Design a protein around this nucleic acid. Sequence first.
DNA 1: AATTGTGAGCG
DNA 2: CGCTCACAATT
Length: 51
Amino acid sequence: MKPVTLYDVAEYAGVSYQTVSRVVNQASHVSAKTREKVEAAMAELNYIPNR
DNA sequence: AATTGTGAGCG
DNA sequence: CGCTCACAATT
Ligand code: NA
């Protein structure tokens, strides 16, 4: 399956791969609508942890 | 001060 | 190349 990285969800959502990382781990500085976009994205793309 | 991006450092 | 961790320079 399509190896959906953080970079991929991040690009689609409207955020940097760092921020989508700090949704998962080192979680900090993912603000209201940007985090809503990642919560959207997590479903709209089927993210693969580590690849 | 608030986050991104740079860097750094492990995977 | 993939992800986490903390930090400062831009803003
Ligand atoms: Na992860």
